[PDB]
Design a protein around this motif. Structure first.
Motif, PDB file in Angstrom:
ATOM      1  N   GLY A  59     -67.273  15.067  50.332  1.00  0.00           N
ATOM      2  CA  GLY A  59     -66.738  15.407  48.813  1.00  0.00           C
ATOM      3  C   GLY A  59     -67.206  16.502  48.327  1.00  0.00           C
ATOM      4  O   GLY A  59     -66.499  17.180  47.622  1.00  0.00           O
ATOM      5  N   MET A  60     -68.647  16.610  48.144  1.00  0.00           N
ATOM      6  CA  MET A  60     -69.018  17.686  47.363  1.00  0.00           C
ATOM      7  C   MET A  60     -69.127  18.920  48.189  1.00  0.00           C
ATOM      8  O   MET A  60     -69.179  20.152  47.457  1.00  0.00           O
ATOM      9  CB  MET A  60     -70.787  17.118  47.044  1.00  0.00           C
ATOM     10  N   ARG A  61     -69.522  18.783  49.652  1.00  0.00           N
ATOM     11  CA  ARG A  61     -69.387  20.141  50.154  1.00  0.00           C
ATOM     12  C   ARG A  61     -67.888  20.657  50.103  1.00  0.00           C
ATOM     13  O   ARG A  61     -67.857  22.186  49.741  1.00  0.00           O
ATOM     14  CB  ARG A  61     -69.672  20.044  51.813  1.00  0.00           C
ATOM     15  N   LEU A  62     -66.911  19.997  49.794  1.00  0.00           N
ATOM     16  CA  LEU A  62     -65.509  20.566  49.624  1.00  0.00           C
ATOM     17  C   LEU A  62     -65.229  21.048  48.410  1.00  0.00           C
ATOM     18  O   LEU A  62     -64.924  22.285  48.012  1.00  0.00           O
ATOM     19  CB  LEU A  62     -64.493  19.439  50.220  1.00  0.00           C
ATOM     20  N   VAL A  63     -65.740  20.402  47.227  1.00  0.00           N
ATOM     21  CA  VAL A  63     -65.367  20.614  46.179  1.00  0.00           C
ATOM     22  C   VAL A  63     -66.018  21.767  45.735  1.00  0.00           C
ATOM     23  O   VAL A  63     -65.765  22.721  44.943  1.00  0.00           O
ATOM     24  CB  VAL A  63     -65.368  19.540  44.962  1.00  0.00           C
ATOM     25  N   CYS A  64     -67.419  21.911  46.277  1.00  0.00           N
ATOM     26  CA  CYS A  64     -68.085  23.080  45.850  1.00  0.00           C
ATOM     27  C   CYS A  64     -67.665  24.507  46.741  1.00  0.00           C
ATOM     28  O   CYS A  64     -67.740  25.537  45.957  1.00  0.00           O
ATOM     29  CB  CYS A  64     -69.663  22.879  46.034  1.00  0.00           C
ATOM     30  N   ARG A  65     -67.390  24.210  47.773  1.00  0.00           N
ATOM     31  CA  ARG A  65     -66.789  25.360  48.533  1.00  0.00           C
ATOM     32  C   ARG A  65     -65.566  25.883  47.720  1.00  0.00           C
ATOM     33  O   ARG A  65     -65.223  27.194  47.439  1.00  0.00           O
ATOM     34  CB  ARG A  65     -66.335  25.171  50.044  1.00  0.00           C
ATOM     35  N   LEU A  66     -64.575  24.881  47.160  1.00  0.00           N
ATOM     36  CA  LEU A  66     -63.514  25.477  46.403  1.00  0.00           C
ATOM     37  C   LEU A  66     -63.985  26.191  45.131  1.00  0.00           C
ATOM     38  O   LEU A  66     -63.094  27.248  44.661  1.00  0.00           O
ATOM     39  CB  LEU A  66     -62.720  24.302  46.256  1.00  0.00           C
ATOM     40  N   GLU A 134     -66.495  47.809  28.058  1.00  0.00           N
ATOM     41  CA  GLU A 134     -67.836  48.531  28.859  1.00  0.00           C
ATOM     42  C   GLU A 134     -69.027  48.308  28.245  1.00  0.00           C
ATOM     43  O   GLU A 134     -69.299  48.589  27.245  1.00  0.00           O
ATOM     44  CB  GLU A 134     -67.321  49.875  28.921  1.00  0.00           C
ATOM     45  N   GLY A 135     -69.803  47.923  29.120  1.00  0.00           N
ATOM     46  CA  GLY A 135     -71.365  47.613  28.674  1.00  0.00           C
ATOM     47  C   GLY A 135     -71.717  46.209  28.409  1.00  0.00           C
ATOM     48  O   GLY A 135     -72.576  45.704  28.461  1.00  0.00           O
ATOM     49  N   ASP A 136     -70.448  45.390  28.253  1.00  0.00           N
ATOM     50  CA  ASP A 136     -70.555  43.902  28.061  1.00  0.00           C
ATOM     51  C   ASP A 136     -71.059  43.377  29.288  1.00  0.00           C
ATOM     52  O   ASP A 136     -71.186  43.785  30.632  1.00  0.00           O
ATOM     53  CB  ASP A 136     -69.277  43.047  28.131  1.00  0.00           C
ATOM     54  N   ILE A 137     -72.039  42.187  29.337  1.00  0.00           N
ATOM     55  CA  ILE A 137     -72.392  41.093  30.575  1.00  0.00           C
ATOM     56  C   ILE A 137     -71.268  39.930  30.120  1.00  0.00           C
ATOM     57  O   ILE A 137     -71.293  39.431  29.020  1.00  0.00           O
ATOM     58  CB  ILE A 137     -73.711  40.863  30.509  1.00  0.00           C
ATOM     59  N   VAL A 138     -70.879  39.272  31.249  1.00  0.00           N
ATOM     60  CA  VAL A 138     -70.463  38.285  30.752  1.00  0.00           C
ATOM     61  C   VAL A 138     -70.133  37.186  31.952  1.00  0.00           C
ATOM     62  O   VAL A 138     -70.212  37.475  33.225  1.00  0.00           O
ATOM     63  CB  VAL A 138     -68.679  38.549  30.887  1.00  0.00           C
ATOM     64  N   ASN A 139     -70.595  36.027  31.884  1.00  0.00           N
ATOM     65  CA  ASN A 139     -70.855  34.599  32.747  1.00  0.00           C
ATOM     66  C   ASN A 139     -69.566  33.917  32.681  1.00  0.00           C
ATOM     67  O   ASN A 139     -69.079  33.598  31.829  1.00  0.00           O
ATOM     68  CB  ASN A 139     -71.939  33.837  32.117  1.00  0.00           C
ATOM     69  N   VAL A 140     -69.155  33.678  33.948  1.00  0.00           N
ATOM     70  CA  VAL A 140     -68.040  32.937  34.092  1.00  0.00           C
ATOM     71  C   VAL A 140     -68.465  31.668  34.864  1.00  0.00           C
ATOM     72  O   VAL A 140     -69.100  31.643  35.797  1.00  0.00           O
ATOM     73  CB  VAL A 140     -66.838  33.425  35.124  1.00  0.00           C
ATOM     74  N   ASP A 141     -68.202  30.386  34.108  1.00  0.00           N
ATOM     75  CA  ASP A 141     -68.710  29.316  34.753  1.00  0.00           C
ATOM     76  C   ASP A 141     -67.331  28.306  35.133  1.00  0.00           C
ATOM     77  O   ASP A 141     -66.440  28.241  34.507  1.00  0.00           O
ATOM     78  CB  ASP A 141     -69.397  28.347  33.638  1.00  0.00           C
ATOM     79  N   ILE A 142     -67.456  27.941  36.564  1.00  0.00           N
ATOM     80  CA  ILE A 142     -66.264  27.451  37.227  1.00  0.00           C
ATOM     81  C   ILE A 142     -66.839  25.966  37.733  1.00  0.00           C
ATOM     82  O   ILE A 142     -67.742  25.677  38.292  1.00  0.00           O
ATOM     83  CB  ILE A 142     -65.913  28.210  38.416  1.00  0.00           C
ATOM     84  N   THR A 143     -65.964  24.895  37.395  1.00  0.00           N
ATOM     85  CA  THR A 143     -65.945  23.427  37.667  1.00  0.00           C
ATOM     86  C   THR A 143     -64.949  23.021  38.211  1.00  0.00           C
ATOM     87  O   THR A 143     -63.905  23.167  37.387  1.00  0.00           O
ATOM     88  CB  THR A 143     -67.066  22.611  36.755  1.00  0.00           C
ATOM     89  N   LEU A 144     -64.934  22.331  39.424  1.00  0.00           N
ATOM     90  CA  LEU A 144     -63.673  21.911  39.885  1.00  0.00           C
ATOM     91  C   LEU A 144     -63.731  20.490  40.219  1.00  0.00           C
ATOM     92  O   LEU A 144     -64.918  20.035  40.651  1.00  0.00           O
ATOM     93  CB  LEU A 144     -63.270  22.453  41.505  1.00  0.00           C
ATOM     94  N   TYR A 145     -62.684  19.579  39.959  1.00  0.00           N
ATOM     95  CA  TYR A 145     -62.863  18.247  40.620  1.00  0.00           C
ATOM     96  C   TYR A 145     -61.445  17.738  41.396  1.00  0.00           C
ATOM     97  O   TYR A 145     -60.513  18.167  41.450  1.00  0.00           O
ATOM     98  CB  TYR A 145     -62.446  17.465  39.240  1.00  0.00           C
ATOM     99  N   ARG A 146     -62.136  17.093  42.447  1.00  0.00           N
ATOM    100  CA  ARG A 146     -61.372  17.017  43.685  1.00  0.00           C
ATOM    101  C   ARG A 146     -61.642  15.489  44.266  1.00  0.00           C
ATOM    102  O   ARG A 146     -62.833  15.357  44.521  1.00  0.00           O
ATOM    103  CB  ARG A 146     -61.499  18.343  44.812  1.00  0.00           C
ATOM    104  N   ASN A 147     -60.724  14.905  44.505  1.00  0.00           N
ATOM    105  CA  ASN A 147     -60.822  13.600  45.319  1.00  0.00           C
ATOM    106  C   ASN A 147     -62.094  12.750  44.580  1.00  0.00           C
ATOM    107  O   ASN A 147     -62.905  12.103  45.293  1.00  0.00           O
ATOM    108  CB  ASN A 147     -61.318  13.680  46.893  1.00  0.00           C
ATOM    109  N   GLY A 148     -62.196  12.895  43.275  1.00  0.00           N
ATOM    110  CA  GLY A 148     -63.227  12.179  42.622  1.00  0.00           C
ATOM    111  C   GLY A 148     -64.696  12.821  42.392  1.00  0.00           C
ATOM    112  O   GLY A 148     -65.584  12.226  41.927  1.00  0.00           O
ATOM    113  N   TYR A 149     -64.704  14.066  43.003  1.00  0.00           N
ATOM    114  CA  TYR A 149     -66.158  14.768  43.040  1.00  0.00           C
ATOM    115  C   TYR A 149     -66.093  16.096  42.015  1.00  0.00           C
ATOM    116  O   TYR A 149     -65.081  16.771  42.389  1.00  0.00           O
ATOM    117  CB  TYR A 149     -66.590  15.093  44.277  1.00  0.00           C
ATOM    118  N   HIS A 150     -67.017  16.447  41.415  1.00  0.00           N
ATOM    119  CA  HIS A 150     -67.141  17.667  40.639  1.00  0.00           C
ATOM    120  C   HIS A 150     -68.109  18.599  41.413  1.00  0.00           C
ATOM    121  O   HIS A 150     -69.198  18.105  41.618  1.00  0.00           O
ATOM    122  CB  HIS A 150     -67.722  17.518  39.275  1.00  0.00           C
TER     123      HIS A 150
END
Ligand SMILES: [K+]
Length: 305
Positions: A59-66, A134-150
């Protein structure tokens, strides 16, 4: 009377909250009025770390790949002129297309589907109407939830051409994360990672954020263990095969101290200098670790283009 620490300001109003179609399974806090997670609440305060079963590992392998797939969708939109709200809309749709819930959404009433942290924002920036510059740095943080796993990851990106200090900060933060991951194996104490990360950060003239830490993640968004990224911390626990957790160092150009905007989420450096972050979700194996949120199709993070 809130005094901003740097040049950034929130750019309001925010678009109305985006609904998630009801066919998408939702985590417990998704429908709590204050976005509290009764799952997290029930184990609140424990030191015991889950040993994932075989089903859990799948379940974790799947949600983390997505989740990695969705971060790569965000990466390809980074350019001057795009607003963080536009990135968030794209992320939201990409989550849903993968039959996943965007875990940040309504977590303690967080109003968006991802976190976008520009320049002095350490973490938990709220996507808004500001176009990237231009010149900014930006972090994007992605968390998904699938079949009960984040599953969670993040990367910092360059917006157009950036200065030498931005490149050094982002490169060094990425190195800190990878030195930490390389140390991960059964029998290593969770408190050792901060020693590794701070040694590299400090050798490069940077500071390490203390108020936010890596954490266990699986059926709970945040749970044991707690993983601080600074040296000589008092984190409890020893890695064992079957443990899953995030490592997510936040490195600053100036001082380590943080404060929170009036919005209750956006964490900024108190001195207004820039911060960078990278994060993976890790599974400890019988001999080392599995980087569940790794890219599968390219050797390097996006800022190395
Ligand atoms: K930042």
């Amino acid at each position: 009377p809130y005094r901003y620490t740097g040049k950034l300001r929130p750019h309001y109003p925010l678009m109305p909250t985006r609904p998630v179609p009801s066919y998408i399974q939702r985590p417990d806090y998704a429908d709590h009025p204050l976005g509290m997670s009764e799952s997290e609440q029930a184990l609140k305060g424990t030191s015991q770390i889950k040993l994932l079963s075989s089903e859990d590992i799948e379940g974790m392998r799947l949600v983390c790949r997505l989740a990695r797939e969705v971060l790569d969708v965000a990466a390809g939109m980074i350019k001057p002129g795009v607003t963080t709200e536009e990135i968030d809309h794209a992320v939201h749709l990409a989550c849903i297309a993968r039959n996943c819930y965007p875990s940040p959404l309504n977590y303690y009433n967080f109003p968006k589907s991802c976190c976008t942290s520009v320049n002095e924002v350490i973490c938990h920036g709220i996507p808004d109407r500001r176009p990237l510059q231009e010149g900014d740095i930006v972090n994007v943080d992605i968390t998904l939830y699938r079949n009960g796993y984040h599953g969670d990851l993040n990367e910092t990106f360059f917006v157009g051409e950036v200065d030498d200090g931005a490149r050094k900060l982002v490169q060094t933060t990425y190195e800190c994360l990878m030195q930490a991951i390389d140390a991960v194996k059964p029998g290593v104490r969770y408190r050792e990672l901060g020693n590794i990360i701070q040694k590299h950060a400090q050798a490069n003239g940077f500071s390490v954020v203390r108020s936010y830490c890596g954490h266990g993640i699986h059926k709970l968004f945040h749970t044991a263990p707690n993983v601080p990224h600074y040296a000589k911390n008092k984190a409890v626990g020893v890695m064992k095969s079957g443990h899953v957790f995030t490592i997510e160092p936040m490195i600053c150009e100036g001082g380590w101290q943080d404060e929170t905007w009036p919005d209750g989420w956006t964490a900024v450096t108190r001195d207004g200098k820039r911060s960078a972050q990278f994060e993976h979700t890790l599974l400890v194996t019988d001999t080392g670790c599995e980087i569940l949120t790794r890219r599968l199709d390219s050797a390097r993070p996006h800022f190395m283009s």
